[PDB]
Every structure is written in structure tokens, then in C-alpha cells.
Amino acid sequence: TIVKPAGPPRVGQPSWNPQRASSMPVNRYRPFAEEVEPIRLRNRTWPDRVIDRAPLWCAVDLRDGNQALIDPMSPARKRRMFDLLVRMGYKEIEVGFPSASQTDFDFVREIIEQGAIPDDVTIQVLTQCRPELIERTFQACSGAPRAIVHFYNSTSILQRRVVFRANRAEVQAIATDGARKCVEQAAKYPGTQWRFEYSPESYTGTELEYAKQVCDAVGEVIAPTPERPIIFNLPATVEMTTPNVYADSIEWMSRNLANRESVILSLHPHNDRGTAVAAAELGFAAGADRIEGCLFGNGERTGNVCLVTLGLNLFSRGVDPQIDFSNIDEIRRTVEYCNQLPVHERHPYGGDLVYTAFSGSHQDAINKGLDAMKLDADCDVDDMLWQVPYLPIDPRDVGRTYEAV
Amino acid sequence: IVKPAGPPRVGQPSWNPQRASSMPVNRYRPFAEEVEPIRLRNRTWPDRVIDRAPLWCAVDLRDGNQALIDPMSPARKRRMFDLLVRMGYKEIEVGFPSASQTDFDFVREIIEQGAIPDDVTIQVLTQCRPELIERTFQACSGAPRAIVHFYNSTSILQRRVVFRANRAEVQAIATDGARKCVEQAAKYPGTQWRFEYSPESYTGTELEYAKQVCDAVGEVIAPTPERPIIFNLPATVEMTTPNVYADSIEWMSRNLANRESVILSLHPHNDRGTAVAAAELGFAAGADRIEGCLFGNGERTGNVCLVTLGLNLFSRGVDPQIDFSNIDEIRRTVEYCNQLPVHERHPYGGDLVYTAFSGSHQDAINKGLDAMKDVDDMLWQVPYLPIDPRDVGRTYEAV
Ligand SMILES: CC(C)C(=O)C(=O)O
Ligand SMILES: CC(C)C(=O)C(=O)O
Ligand SMILES: [Mn+2]
Ligand SMILES: [Mn+2]
């Protein structure tokens, strides 16, 4: 049942606020600062930087997406999703997890063997750090012109204790032993242009100086340069606190990571507090270079950050996302087809209801803007500055329509 | 769909093969130029961590309802009101009675049947034309207390294209409304009236001006610390990043006249997908009050989600002062009232948000649950599950 909070008000709670204390077991949860650590960052700059360029995108729909699904992608559905990501303009695509999943392996073999990989596309494959998984991962990419090997291990306070029952050095040695193995294997398969990504998985549960240490040591092995750089990918595996703190944490890593101009700083935010998009946009302003997510926000649990929202959030403020969202219906249809999961009615940009006005006063206001833009134009209306109340973008700019209803 | 084939940007790294799309970005301008740059010096919100629940106002019966494909029946409206009351909300916007007969009908019914608990204050939306204000007051006849929420659009775009009207002229709309509100209140003693003013399209409005109109509306209403006014600053359209919203909110809280007779309330829509962030950063900015909906119903992309805001407090150890202990029940009732599903991936309530499919995550949660072993009272320490699903009446599902 649902029962009205009737506990005392807080000390200092103003008289005009009649809310009462719930019976929820708040004692079981700690503020982020105590669960992990306080914010390290001094003199942040991200609040003063407006994004004026698109980042490097990496679409993880085929891995992080696929793995969160109720109904796994068939070989047909993965090809279909690969082709969409390719046609949209994406250049780095995590095509799966071939050491752990025989159908992923099957998938990678297939796109390489059939010459499905375009010349400007770099496939990305996920692996854990154990040696024979790294080997399997290299065998799966055999024949590939280029590939990102993404190796990872969990570094969080919580996971060092209850999963690995291990200390800092040992947890770092896993990553570094993982980098050695990667370097060994890449020399065993010349031809392929091998590139690396390292994630301290559960980063947002990891102490920053410790995240920096592990990354730097991974860096030492790999020996990236400004022409052949490494990716350090900082996931909010669980989105653990507000977006500003994630950004602060990104700004700290970007200032502080060793060999910074040989590093591609990548964001990988999940949406557990509903703020994955904000985490990304602020973390990009904080100095990241790259963002991993999924079309329409598919991905474990609450999902990966939404590639469509981020892309169009740039477009609608005058920045070219470098991805084609001209026909958002088509993107959505393929997405829903691949994942077997609807895009919500109220999803930003693609949801069924997002260019709908039911309010009489909003329909009238939309009519005033649309009628006004005609005047100024009589150049060509479809080319003028968009100026319509309640319609952030011209719906025809993403192939949709405004409906008064 | 057409692969972007334009050139790279000047100075684009060689490791980024991305090409310019053919999308008409020249039609859109940065927020700084579309409205105004950031007015806020020495912001403080980035260093403040929320340590108490805001005053919640649910707008499901008004901003939510008007967004629906299928309008709430009288029964579904009662259901929603009851859910809101039962969860512990204390201010509920019940409709737009002056311009909607079924709204008007709903208001009469909750008042006449005694469906409002004494700690609950109903809210009614009205525009500024004087016959609409009169009608709003008539709808509330017999209520022991009510918030009359009047509003008018204040944005640069709306001043120009809708009102064909200047600053001064648009503020007199608000202040003439405030004056009418004071006349009407005097005409109906026996209800304790309180006021809310929103410069509608606030995020498309210069700040100096939004403060001007608010201060002016406030001077007429003459609020006090005991009888304070609500100034509600909506992101009618979520127009930029949530930091800038938070900034704008901080500047208004810092600079609004008679600040301790004010309840600064937030009203974020979700057009950029950052409503929850706008609210949270806006609250740290020193707002006092948030309007939203359960599960983020509302115009277009929705109001900010009251469920997400609430449980985001709980899961970091702040009592939201709202019972979310049966999220399935809250969800069932919302889906029924709205005729519109909570997404599978909606925070806290979605079908899949406590599912681990991948084996490593499954192993890891089992390490966590096993280490943990009264367990239900210990600190929740499990990888990949932000909360114990049972604290919201759900279960963890290994599949
Ligand atoms: C595999 C890792 C990078 C991941 O998906 C996450 O941590 O969110
Ligand atoms: C009525 C107003 C306050 C509103 O809902 C909005 O601005 O979104
Ligand atoms: Mn992930
Ligand atoms: Mn609204």
C-alpha cells in the first residue's frame, strides 16, 4: 500500500512547507562524498565553456545496447544496426564482446570477412583483462584493417572489496598485465592498425587519484603518442551522483592525466539518476574528447547516454553534430526494429509527442511564430532562423511534422 | 539517410574521421545569442550538495493532463489526486478552471465533496485577462486555501511575435493581473488565498527583465515571510544546458526583491533531456520548490520527473518526504491515469532498471548480496544496483 509520510518535519523546515518525514530507509544510503570521496577539483572551468564543436562519437549499441536487451539481436538485426550507424556518420562502433559471446565473435568474423567495414570506420571490441580472453579478442579481429581493443576491469572501492577481495596495486596490476598482453598480441598480428581503449570500470565509484594512477600505468605500457594515442574511457557505470560532480571529476582527470596530448578522454555515462545526457554535455565542456552511447538510450538498466539527444542538442543550438538526423522517424524505426523496444512518446526529438501542441494558447502562439516567419521571408522560409514559440526546432528539419491537435 | 560528406572542421584531429553533415545548423543560434549570455558571477551551486527535500508541487492534473492524447476522465482525475495526496504531496495543481469546463468541474467536486486534506493546498492556473481571474476565484469558492497561479509569457520571441509588445507593456499585463488578484481575494474572504506568478518562457527571457516583472508583481501582492509569494521560473522550453539554467536561478534568488518573502520555484521541461539536471542544479542554486509530474508526463517531452527527483534524494540518503515504497503501485496508477507507459528504462520505475543480463554483472551482484549477509537495515552495498529494489517494493532480477 502507499501511506502518507507523517514523521516530523526537519529542523529548520519553514512553516509554509507541510511535508513530513517518510518512512523510507534513508539510513541505508550515504551521500556521494562519503560513499566515495569529496570533489577534488579546484577552479573548475566547465561551467564557463559552451560546447562549439561535436565530439568523437562512439556508438556502443551493438554491445552495451545489445547486452541489455530482452530479445537479443539476430545476425540480421545486428547487420541492420551496423548499417544505420554507418549511414548516420559514426566512425567508431563497438561491435561487441567476442571473447565472451560466441554470437558476437560470429558477428565480428562476419563483418570483417564480408568487407562490411567502411574505410573510415574503426570497429571496437570489448574484452576483460585475462590473457586468453585478450587472445580470443585479437583472433576475432583477424583481417580487420583497424580496430580498437577496449580492455577493462572494475576499479571501484566497492568492487575492490567484495568482487576482487584485493588492494589497489593488485587491481592496478590486472589493468597493466592487460596492457602487456595487448601489446604482445598486437605485435603478433601486424597489418591491422591496432588501437587501445582502457576503462577503469565503475570509475564513478573509484577514487580519482586511484583512477589517474591506474590509467597512467596503463598508459606507460601502451606508450601512446599524439599520432597513435590511447583512449581512456571514464564510465559512470552506475550514475552515482549529480552531473556537475561527474564533470568536475572529468575536468580533474583531463588536467591531471599523464601524457594528456596522447590521450583520447572518453565519456561513458549511464542514466541511473536520469542525468546521463547532462553528465555528458558538462563532461565534454570539462575537456573530454569523445563520448560513448547508444541511439535512443538503450543500454544496461536505465541505458547509455542517448546519442540522438546529444547530437540534436548540438544542432538545435547551431553546432553541427556531424551526424545525419535529417530523418529521425527512419532512425527510430530501425532502432525499435533492432532492439525490439519502443522509443518513448516523450523522448527528446524522436518521441511521438515531442512536436505536439494540445494547448489552445500554444497552438495560437505556434501559429503566430510560423505566420511571422513567412513575412520576414517573403529568401526562403525553410532557410531562415527558426523562430516559433514552443518548437525548439523546425520539425521538418528532422523529417517530422508539427501537429496541432 | 545520408552519410555526412562535408569537410572536417578547421583543426579537427586526424584521429576523428567525422564529416560535416548537411543539417541546417545556420537556422539555430547558440543560447548566448538567441537570448543573452550568463549574467552570474561567482556561482555557488556547483559547491552545494542537496541535503533536504524541496517543497514539491505536482502538476500532473494540469500540465500533465493537457499533454495527454486521452484526457483523464473524472474518475482518472480522482485516482491521480488521491495518489498524489497519499504519497505525501502538499501542493497540487488541479487544473485550469477558467478556460476548461471539465477542470472547473473537477475543482468544484474536490471542494464540495471534502476530498482536500487540511495540509493540502490546491493550485489553479490562470491567465491574466480579468474575466479569467474572476472565474478562477469562483471555481475555488468554499476552499479553505488555494494558490492562484497567474502567468503571462515574458520571452523576447513571444514579446515580438505573439504580443507585438514592449517590455513595459508585457509587465503591466502581469501587474494588472496581480492587482485583479488582490481585488478578487478581498471579495472572497474565508479562503486563505496565496499567489504564484510565472514569467512564462522565462528561459527565453532576459534576466534583468524577469526580475523586473517579478519584483513589480511582488510589490502589488505585497508578500511577507508569513504570507509569501511564489515566483515560479519555468523552462517552458528547455533551451540550453542545465548549468545555465542553474546559473540563471542563482542570479534570481540572489537578486529578487524581498527575497525572504519569496518561494522560488522551478518548472523545467525536458526538450534537451536535461529536466532532472536543471531541477537538481536549480535547487542547489537556492530555489525552494519544484513543480513536475510523476514519471515525467507534461507538454511534449514532459515536466521534470517527480519520481526521479525524489528517489535521487533517497538513494544518496536524503528523505524526499514522499513515500516511494511501492513504485509498482505508483506506476500502475500513473499508467492508468495517463494512458501512457513508463519507459522500460525510466529511472527507478522502468521494467528493466533492476535487471542484470550480463554474467559478470550477475556474478558481481551475487558477491555483493552474499558479502552483505538484519541485512535489510545494513548499508546497501551491491555493485550495479544503486538501491535495494525492495526499498521501492521491487525485486532484483537475474536473467
Ligand atoms: C564495459 C564498461 C566500459 C561499461 O560498459 C560500463 O562500465 O558502463
Ligand atoms: C503554465 C506555465 C508555468 C508552464 O507550464 C510552463 O511554462 O511550462
Ligand atoms: Mn556501460
Ligand atoms: Mn509547463
Where do the domains of chain B lie? 43-340, 341-399
Atom 5 of ligand 2, residue of closest alpha carbon: B63
Q: Which of A149, A237, A270 to mutate to test the pocket of ligand 1 (most atoms within 8 A of CB)?
A: A237
For chain A, the distance separating the N- and C-terminal CA atoms, rounded to the nearest angstrom, is: 37
Helix runs in B270-317, H state only = 275-284, 306-314
Alpha carbons B265 and B258: distance in angstroms, whole number: 15
* Nearest CA-CA partner of A355 in A310, A389, A391, A387: A391
Centre of ligand 3 from the C-alpha of residue B76, in Å: 39
- Give the three cell numbers for residue B104: 472547473
Q: Which of B151, B202, B301 to mutate to test the pocket of ligand 2 (most atoms within 8 A of CB)?
A: B151
Domains B43-340 and B341-399 share a fold: no
Alpha carbons A119 and A232: distance in angstroms, whole number: 24
Question: Is-contact A294 A64, C-beta < 8 A?
Answer: yes
What is the CATH class of A44-341? alpha beta
B195, containing H or E segment? strand B192-200
* B18: nearest CB among A26, A91, A351: A91
Alpha carbons B337 and A347: distance in angstroms, whole number: 20
Residues facing residue A147 across a β-bridge: A123, A194
At B266 the three-state DSSP class reads strand
Q: Between A and B, how many residue pairs show a Cβ–Cβ distance under 8 A?
A: 382
Alpha carbons A237 and A44: distance in angstroms, whole number: 23
Taking the CA atoms of B132, B133, B138 and B143 in sequence, report the sign of the dihedral they define.
positive
* A323: nearest CB among B4, B46, B83: B4
Nearest CA in chain A to B341: A344
* B381: nearest CB among A18, A26, A162: A162
SS3 for chain A is CCCCCCCCCCCCCCCCCCCCCCCCCHHHCCCHHHHCCCCCCCCCCHHHCCCCCCCEEEECHHHHHHHHCCCCCCHHHHHHHHHHHHHHCCCEEEEECCCCCHHHHHHHHHHHHCCCCCCCCEEEEEEECCHHHHHHHHHHCCCCCEEEEEEEEECCHHHHHHCCCCCHHHHHHHHHHHHHHHHHHHHHCCCCEEEEEEEEECHHHCCHHHHHHHHHHHHHHHCCCCCCCEEEEEEECCCCCCHHHHHHHHHHHHHHCCCHHHEEEEEEEECCCCCHHHHHHHHHHCCCCEEEEEHHHCCCCCCECEHHHHHHHHHCCCCCCCCCCCCHHHHHHHHHHHHCCCCCCCCCCCCCCCCEECCHHHHHHHHHHHHHHHHHHCCCHHHCCCCCCCCCCCHHHHCCCCEEC
Interface with A, mutate which of B72, B122, B315, B333 (most A CBs under 10 A): B315
Question: Is-contact A354 A347, C-beta < 8 A?
Answer: yes
Alpha carbons A388 and B316: distance in angstroms, whole number: 40
* Nearest CA-CA partner of B294 in B148, B89, B142: B89
Residues 6+ apart with CB under 8 A from A391: A355, A366, A369, A402
At B292 the three-state DSSP class reads strand
CB contact under 8 A, B320 and A22: yes
Q: Which of B154, B264, B269, B293 to mutate to test the pocket of ligand 2 (most atoms within 8 A of CB)?
A: B269
At B33 the three-state DSSP class reads helix
Q: Tell which atom from ligand 2 comes closest to the C-alpha of B299.
A: 8
Q: Which residues of B touch A4 (CB under 8 A)?
A: 85-88, 323
Q: Which residues of A touch B242 (CB under 8 A)?
A: 243, 278, 282
Query: CA B377 from chain center: how many Å?
Result: 32
At B10 the three-state DSSP class reads coil
| CA R_g for chain A | 23
Alpha-carbon torsion, ordered A324, A71, B301, B70, to 10 deg = 130
Question: Is-contact B107 B163, C-beta < 8 A?
Answer: no
Alpha carbons B87 and B330: distance in angstroms, whole number: 9
Alpha carbons B148 and B230: distance in angstroms, whole number: 10
Query: What residue numbers of B does the annotated binding site for Mg(2+) cover?
Result: 63, 267, 269, 303
Alpha carbons A245 and A35: distance in angstroms, whole number: 14
B92, containing H or E segment? strand B91-95
Alpha carbons B2 and B23: distance in angstroms, whole number: 10
Helix runs in B1-46, H state only = 31-34
In which residue are the cell numbers 512547507 written?
A17
Query: What residue numbers of B does the annotated binding site cover?
Result: 62-63, 236, 267, 269, 303
Alpha carbons B326 and A2: distance in angstroms, whole number: 6
Rounded to the nearest 10 degrees, what angle do helices B130-139 and B101-112 cross at?
A: 30
* A2: nearest CB among B326, B357, B367: B326
* Nearest CA-CA partner of B389 in B333, B336, B311: B311
Q: How many CB atoms lie within 10 A of CB B340?
A: 21
Query: Does any ligand 2 atom lie closer than 6 A to the CB of residue B151?
Result: yes
Pairing of strands A92-96, A263-269: unpaired
Taking the CA atoms of A30, A36, A42 and A44 in sequence, report the sign of the dihedral they define.
negative
Kindly list the distances between the CA atom of residue B207 and the CA atoms of A60, B95, B250, B317, in Å, as whole numbers in the listed order: 40, 28, 11, 34
Kindly list the distances between the CA atom of residue A118 and the CA atoms of A83, A191, A230, A292, A359, in Å, as whole numbers in the listed order: 10, 17, 22, 20, 47
Query: Does any ligand 1 atom lie closer than 6 A to the CB of residue A254?
Result: no
Atom 6 of ligand 1, residue of closest alpha carbon: A237
Query: Does any ligand 1 atom lie closer than 6 A to the CB of residue A309?
Result: no
Which of the ligands is closest to the CA of residue B96? 2
- Give the three cell numbers for residue A124: 571496437
B230, containing H or E segment? strand B229-235
Q: How many CB atoms lie within 10 A of CB A115?
A: 9
Nearest CA in chain A to B22: A324
**CB neighbour class for A10 (10 Å; exposed up to 12, middle 13-18, buried from 19):** middle
Alpha carbons A93 and A294: distance in angstroms, whole number: 10
For chain B, the distance separating the N- and C-terminal CA atoms, rounded to the nearest angstrom, is: 36
Alpha-carbon torsion, ordered B264, B267, B272, B275, to 10 deg = 80
- Give the three cell numbers for residue A27: 539510513
**Length of chain B in terms of residues written:** 399
At B70 the three-state DSSP class reads coil
Residues 6+ apart with CB under 8 A from A330: A399, B1
At B115 the three-state DSSP class reads coil
Interface with B, mutate which of A23, A27, A29, A92 (most B CBs under 10 A): A29
Pick the CATH number of B341-399 from 3.30.460.80, 1.10.238.10, 3.50.50.60, 1.10.287.1400: 1.10.287.1400
Centre of ligand 3 from the C-alpha of residue A145, in Å: 26
Alpha carbons B303 and B266: distance in angstroms, whole number: 11
At B151 the three-state DSSP class reads strand
Nearest CA in chain A to B246: A47
> Does the annotation list A63 as a binding residue?
yes
Residues facing residue B126 across a β-bridge: B150
Pick the CATH number of A342-405 from 1.10.1740.10, 3.40.50.620, 2.40.50.100, 1.10.287.1400: 1.10.287.1400
Alpha carbons B335 and A141: distance in angstroms, whole number: 46
What is the CATH class of B43-340? alpha beta
* Nearest CA-CA partner of B371 in A133, A311, A164: A164
